[PDB]
Structure 1
């Protein structure tokens, strides 16, 4: 189950720009301590890993981690079982995993001075934000409160520390520059399929509107909904009658229409309440966010698209968290992704 035969593997950097400090560089002067004087800095580049099987079948898959994560989540589960990288190389796809700009091996743009500041210019904010273990526990629906599991949970219990250790902050790089890096990757790769997660859901939809090479999207538990500009439907507040979901992203209709040209599937796990749940903010947040996504998919289908919502419990899979691809039944989750690729001919040459 763990063996993989690779025709080739490797990694590379793509995308980004440069920024420059004041003055000139003199090789005769002390180079340490490091200075911005005469300095060129490469910023906002992205790390890319690939593994290619012998005799690939169909399109390469680009796995795009969610918010605060890295390509680790596609390599292995917190308890050390094979991730989707291994499973889909075994399924004879070439597999790309990325660390987007600002995360993991992607660039974090900081210099000599307060975090993110290049002399007088703020490239990213000095003040950061970051989830806690407690916030991520309820965000990912391990259970209703930190330290508590849903009875049906597919989470790999006992490996909580390993799981939360994979998460971290992201600097305030513009989403435009994150999308730009992936568009450049998609141009380099050729026709491919994006597999996204949580925060990278909306970003992958945006990439598809810029990149005809994206031939399909599967988004696990996307966090932000997308609509044509000026056509955001009525979305209710949360059950506390104060909070809202993430403001939906709006794009010009001429770009939105490109989403109708490819098959798109959104995948949701379990324990999302059907009814208002004022006691558990993130459970209720997922209820309304999933509802908003259902309207987004409907809008795509009204433009001639083929956009679907897969609730894993309807396929017989119970208890999945917001990371179904690292849960205990992730082989069965992978099978459903293989089914989608096969239905749409994305596993054929």
Structure 2
């Protein structure tokens, strides 16, 4: 069912700062080709879209895309089925979707000169990085190697091109500045729930420690674990005995303690190996990253928290990739999110 009734919708920019070029601007001189002379540039701002149902119930949801993505992933699946934006407006929540600084409609800070460089100042690095189709295939656990699917896969097969086309690079904007933009959004919205994904997992945890308005977190397949400073537990290397997972983020315990004050759920899909898998780097990476997250959640619970790990196969959902909210069974994944919101009173006024 695709129909949606909106009391209002729209979009806006929030957050960011400015940087200035040298000299002054003279309106009599040729304006194009564009010059840094006399220039003010707005940088690192974030794009925000919202859709509000008639008579909303409970708190607004803020859907935060993973690494190299945009709010598209919450709008539609690669095969054109409704995304979580539609499903949760239908579930009577106001829905915010963002393009964080450096991605999509967010700002990419570059000027007149080599990419990212404002005269002698490097705002972001000129050298970029970006996953290939092959790297993303294994990262997202479509299968163990590019072009191969797990038998049980929930991926919308045949729509591979559409899926990979949604992904791209991110300039080297500091995570501090990304977190700052979302803190400002949360201040603007009021009490809300963060729904994060992969690279935005750790960022949403950070936002919650800075913003009391974050009343809950659901994180799909978070990519970086978080611990109190100096209390990082022993985490093994990968099965190749050379690689490590992403270095866990460390925060002062007084901020970490704030995570114990709200319900937090991490959600993982399928096909994460239980045992070392030296032949398949990313499968093994996910094994150890999921383990690190289990210890992070345990640390929150030892501070009086209510932090849980939901493995979708234990709820009867088999074959999900690292994007469960765009997989073929995404309605069932959404149902489990609604269950979490309902259990914690986040769907009541």
Kindly state the Cα deviation for residue 154 of structure 1 after the two structures are TM-superposed. Answer: 0.0
Kindly state the Cα deviation for residue 223 of structure 1 after the two structures are TM-superposed. Answer: 0.1
| Matches of 2:270 and 2:175, distance apart in 1 | 29
Kindly state the Cα deviation for residue 213 of structure 1 after the two structures are TM-superposed. Answer: 0.1
| Matches of 2:24 and 2:135, distance apart in 1 | 46
Kindly state the Cα deviation for residue 214 of structure 1 after the two structures are TM-superposed. Answer: 0.0
Give the secondary-structure state (helix, strand or coil) at the position aligned to 2:256.
helix
Kindly state the Cα deviation for residue 12 of structure 1 after the two structures are TM-superposed. Answer: 0.1
Give the secondary-structure state (helix, strand or coil) at the position aligned to 2:254.
helix
Give the secondary-structure state (helix, strand or coil) at the position aligned to 1:8.
strand
| Matches of 1:140 and 1:148, distance apart in 2 | 12
| Matches of 1:27 and 1:165, distance apart in 2 | 41
Give the secondary-structure state (helix, strand or coil) at the position aligned to 1:259.
helix
Kindly state the Cα deviation for residue 231 of structure 1 after the two structures are TM-superposed. Answer: 0.1
| Matches of 2:126 and 2:243, distance apart in 1 | 27
Kindly state the Cα deviation for residue 5 of structure 1 after the two structures are TM-superposed. Answer: 0.1
Kindly state the Cα deviation for residue 315 of structure 1 after the two structures are TM-superposed. Answer: 0.1
| Matches of 1:98 and 1:24, distance apart in 2 | 35
Kindly state the Cα deviation for residue 324 of structure 1 after the two structures are TM-superposed. Answer: 0.1
Partner of 1:175: 175
Q: What TM-score results when the alignment is normalised by the length of structure 2?
A: 1.00
Superposition pairs for residues 277-296 of structure 1, below 5 Å?
A: 277-296=277-296
| Matches of 1:340 and 1:40, distance apart in 2 | 45
Runs (5+) with no aligned partner, structure 1: none
Q: Deviations over 1:21-46 (max 9, x none)?
A: 00000000000000000000000000
| Matches of 2:28 and 2:311, distance apart in 1 | 64
Q: Deviations over 1:268-310 (max 9, x none)?
A: 0000000000000000000000000000000000000000000
Kindly state the Cα deviation for residue 182 of structure 1 after the two structures are TM-superposed. Answer: 0.0
| Matches of 1:284 and 1:46, distance apart in 2 | 34
Give the secondary-structure state (helix, strand or coil) at the position aligned to 2:336.
helix
| Matches of 2:135 and 2:236, distance apart in 1 | 23
Partner of 2:102: 102
Give the secondary-structure state (helix, strand or coil) at the position aligned to 1:256.
helix
Kindly state the Cα deviation for residue 200 of structure 1 after the two structures are TM-superposed. Answer: 0.1
After TM superposition, the runs of 4+ consecutive aligned structure 1 residues lying more than 6 A away are none
Kindly state the Cα deviation for residue 62 of structure 1 after the two structures are TM-superposed. Answer: 0.0
Q: Determine whether 1:325 maps to 2:317.
A: no
Partner of 1:260: 260
| Matches of 1:187 and 1:162, distance apart in 2 | 35
Kindly state the Cα deviation for residue 229 of structure 1 after the two structures are TM-superposed. Answer: 0.1
Runs (5+) with no aligned partner, structure 2: none
| Matches of 1:164 and 1:252, distance apart in 2 | 37
| Matches of 1:105 and 1:120, distance apart in 2 | 26
Give the secondary-structure state (helix, strand or coil) at the position aligned to 1:9.
strand
| Matches of 2:187 and 2:122, distance apart in 1 | 30
Give me the CA root mean square deviation.
0.1
Q: What TM-score results when the alignment is normalised by the length of structure 1?
A: 1.00
Kindly state the Cα deviation for residue 181 of structure 1 after the two structures are TM-superposed. Answer: 0.1
